[PDB]
Each structure stands twice: as structure tokens, then as C-alpha cells.
Amino acid sequence: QSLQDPFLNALRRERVPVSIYLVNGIKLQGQIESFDQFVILLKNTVSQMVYKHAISTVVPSRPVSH
Amino acid sequence: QSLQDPFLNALRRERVPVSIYLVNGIKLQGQIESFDQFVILLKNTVSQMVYKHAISTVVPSRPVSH
Amino acid sequence: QSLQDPFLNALRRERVPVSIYLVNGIKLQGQIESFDQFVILLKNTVSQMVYKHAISTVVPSRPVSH
Amino acid sequence: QSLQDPFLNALRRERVPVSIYLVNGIKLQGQIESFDQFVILLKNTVSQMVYKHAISTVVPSRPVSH
Amino acid sequence: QSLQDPFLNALRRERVPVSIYLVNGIKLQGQIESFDQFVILLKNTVSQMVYKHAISTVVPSRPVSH
Amino acid sequence: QSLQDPFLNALRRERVPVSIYLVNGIKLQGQIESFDQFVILLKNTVSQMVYKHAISTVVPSRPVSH
């Protein structure tokens, strides 16, 4: 299930800069390189691996249709 | 199960502004655009994807029947 | 399972004011309107939906038998 | 499984005052009245229901064998 | 699975003092008395029961082979 | 699943220094010695065992292909 995948794929495909806010309030920025049901790979200087269980919200930097 | 879906659907359908409070105390605001069992899409300038595991409470801005 | 349901039902039925403390230390107050295994609906001016995964403790404002 | 139950039962049966520390650092005190795999009922003036997912450590006020 | 058990058993058997850091940054110290897949029993003046879901990292006070 | 394993294996095999940020904002550093689906063993002076449920992001100190 089911909503996640089209939303994240749209961001990934359009290479939209996003802000990922973590469960501790820390903000990550970059482009979604790929994802599965457990992690998101977020690209800027290096690819970092973000655990979805530690994500609170994914905020596109501009409107993106899914 | 079972309580969530009528509650969130009522908010979504009536387009009631809500406050979503996260597990770190951060408050999000907007209208519920859609949801499944893992995320809520919360609309204002952009659609942001909120993970339910990081939500503590959903507070309608006015009384809504479910 | 098994302890939750009689405890929360007693509060709900007796309409006992409770304090719900969240995993971030934030205190909610109101009466338990209904619940399932994922959320509690907590009533005051509006019904708010509290996720049990974000609850640390439910504290009745007075002794209640279960 | 398997370690929890003898440990908590020993506390419950011996009516040992405990400190329950939550995942946010908040300390609860009282005696364990009962428990299942999801919650602990902690007694002082009222019985409060503590969610095990929000517990970090259970600390007996004195040595207890299990 | 699979890595945990040899690591924690090595600490337990060698009675190595460890620091257990919790998800809120609080540090516990003592020796691992026993464990299962849900909790660790950590010994100093009393045995305290630590929930693994609230543990971030287990740090031996000296190098231990597993 | 599926993304984690090639990413972490690449770090492990190349012995890339990483920063592991925990869900409370605390940063760990060292090299990934091994991992399974529940923990990562992170090496510096001692091997410490990090629970993946307490990890927010794994950040390689330099670009690594997976």
C-alpha cells in the first residue's frame, strides 16, 4: 500500500528537490534517487540512506502531481 | 481497523482544515487530500506526505461528525 | 490482547476525564469517545484522533475500576 | 517471549515499587498491578495505563529475583 | 536474526561492562545479565529491564570478539 | 527488501567511514563491520551495536556506488 509509491515516484522521476523532515525535527534536503518500503536514498554530494521509520514528512519544493 | 477511516474520510470529504501534530511536537496544517494505512497527504501550497507512524494526533479545526 | 479494552471501556463508559500523555511529553485531556487497536478518539471542543503508537500513558482523573 | 513475564510478575507479586522510565525520559513510579504484552497498569492514587512501546526501562526500587 | 545474539552473548558471558544508550540519549551502564528478542536485563545494584525498542546502541567498555 | 543491503554492503566492503545519525539527533561515526535486518555493527575503538530502528540516516563520508 499504495499512496507512497506514486507520490515518491513522481518526485523521483521529476527530480524535484524535497525536504525530508525526520522524527526529531531535523530537515534533510536533496533529490530522491530511489526508494523501497524501508528506506529512501536522498542525493546531494553523497547518496544518504534515510530510514522511512524515522521520517515524519516529505515536502516537495514545488507542486508535483501524482 | 476501523475508526481511522471514517474519521479521516469525514475530514477529507468536508475539506476541514486540520492540525496534525507529529511525535516531536511539530504542528502541520492543511486539508487532508487523501490517505492510506501508512501516510496522509496534507494539502496547502504543495501536497506533503505525512507518515502516520510519526503522527500523534489529528485535530479538526471545527467539529466534524464521523 | 486484552488489558487495554476493559481499561479504556471503563473510562469511556463512565465518561471519566483522562489525561493522555504522548511520547513527546505533551498532555492531552478530554473524555474517551471511542477507540480501536490503533487510535483513541478524545473529546472536548472537537473530537481529536490520537494514535496509540504515540501514547505513553493514560491517566484517569479519578479511580476507575476495570 | 519470555524474559519479560517472569520479571514483571515478580515485581507484581512482591508488590515492589518500581520506576518506569519512558522513551522521552519521564519517570513514572508505583506498583505494577497487572500487565499484558501491550500495556502495564501502574498503581498509585489511580491506576494508569502505560504502553510498553513507550517504556525504555523498568527499575525495581530494590533487588527482586525472577 | 542473527547478529544480535552472538554479540550480546559475548558481552553477557565475558561480563563486560557496557553502556546502553537509549533512543532519548540517556545512557545506562552495567553488565548484561540476560536477554531475549524484546528486552535486556542490565545488572548493577538491581536488575533493570531495558526494552530493545528503546535502545539505540550497545557499547562495550572494551573490545569483545563475537 | 532490498535497497538497504547493496547500499550497506558497498560501505562495508569499501570500508568507507560513515556517519550514522540516530532518531534523537546523535551522530555515530566509524566503519560498518557487518549488519543484518535489525542491527549494524559499527567499528572504531570497539565494535558497537546500533539498532536500525533507532537510525534515521546513514551518510557516507564520500561518494560510494551501490
What is the C-alpha to C-alpha distance for residues E57 and E55, in angstroms, rounded to an integer? 6
Sign of the CA dihedral with F21 first, then F27, F31, and F32 last: negative
**Would the CA dihedral through F37, A15, B50, F21 be positive or negative?**
positive
How far apart, in whole angstroms, are the C-alpha atoms of residue A43 and residue E63? 35
How many residue pairs bridge chain B and chain C with CB atoms within 8 Å of each other?
Answer: 63
B38 vs A3: CB contact, 8 Å cut-off? Answer: yes
CATH number, domain with residue C49: 2.30.30.100
> Could you write out the three-class secondary structure of chain E?
CCCHHHHHHHHHHHCCEEEEEECCCCEEEEEEEEECCCEEEEECCCEEEEEHHHEEEEEECCCCCC
User: Of F33, F25, F34, F31, which Cα lies nearest the Cα of F57?
Assistant: F25
How close C45 gets to chain D, by Cα (Å)? 24
Residue C39 β-bridge partners: C51
Q: Residue C22: which of B2, B56, B58 has the nearest Cβ?
A: B56
Instruction: List beta partners, residue F9.
Output: none
Vertex D13 angle, CA D9 and D15, to 5°? 115
Q: Which three cell numbers stand for residue D7?
A: 520479571
CB contact at 8 A, A47 and F64: yes
CB contact under 8 A, A63 and B53: no
The answer to whether residue C22 neighbours chain B at the CB level (below 8 Å) is yes
> For residues F60 and F49, what is the distance between their CA atoms, to the nearest angstrom?
18
- Between the CA atoms of F25, F30, E43 and E22, what dihedral angle is there, to the nearest 10 degrees? 10
Q: Which residue range forms the structural domain that includes residue A44?
A: 1-66
The shortest C-alpha distance from C53 to chain B (Å) reads 7
- Report cis status (omega within 30 of 0) of the bond before B2: yes
Q: What is the DSSP letter of B48?
A: E
DSSP state of F47: E
Asked if E26 reaches chain F (Cβ–Cβ under 8 Å), the answer is no
Cell of A40: 529512501
CB contact at 8 A, A50 and A61: no
User: How close is the nearest chain B Cα to the Cα of C42, in Å?
Assistant: 10
Contacts of D38 in chain C (CB under 8 A): 1-4
C-alpha cell at B11: 475530514
- Contact check, Cβ <8 Å, C26/B21: yes
B27-36 contacts at long range (C-beta below 8 A, 24 or more positions apart): B28/A57, B32/B8, B34/A3, B35/A3, B35/B8, B36/A1, B36/A2, B36/A3, B36/A4
Nearest to E41 among D3, D21, D55 (CB): D3
How close B63 comes to chain C (CA, Å)? 5
Residues of C in contact with B52 (CB under 8 A): 51
CB contact under 8 A, F49 and E4: yes
- Rounded to an integer, what distance in angstroms lies between the CA atom of residue A62 and that of residue E41? 49
CA distance E33 to E15: 8
The span from the CA of C43 to the CA of C46, in Å, is: 6
Residues with Cβ within 8 Å of residue B55, at least 6 apart in sequence: B20, B21, B22, B23, B40, C51, C54
Residues C56 and D53: their CA atoms lie apart, in Å, by 8
CA C27 to chain centre: 11
Q: To the nearest whole angstrom, how far is the Cα of A49 from the nearest Cα of chain B?
A: 17
What b/e sequence results for C7-43 when a residue is b if at least 16 CB atoms lie within 10 Å of its CB, and e otherwise? bbebbbeeebebebbbbbebebebbbbbbeeebbbbe
Cell, residue D23: 522513551
Experimental technique, in short, is X-ray
Q: CB contact, 8 Å: C38 with chain D?
A: no
Structural domains counted in chain C: 1
Interchain contact, C23 vs D48, CB within 8 Å: no
Tell me whether C38 touches chain B (CB under 8 Å).
yes
Contact F63 A47 (CB under 8 A): yes
Q: How far is E24 from chain F (nearest CA, A)?
A: 6
What Cα–Cα distance (Å) separates residue B8 from each residue in A66, B5, B52, B64? Answer: 20, 5, 12, 10
Question: Grid coordinates in use for F48?
Answer: 558497537
Q: Could you tell me if B1 lies within 8 Å of chain C, comparing CB atoms?
A: yes
3-state helix, strand, coil in chain C (%, to 5): 20, 45, 30
**Chain A and chain D touch, per 3+ beta carbon pairs within 8 A:** no
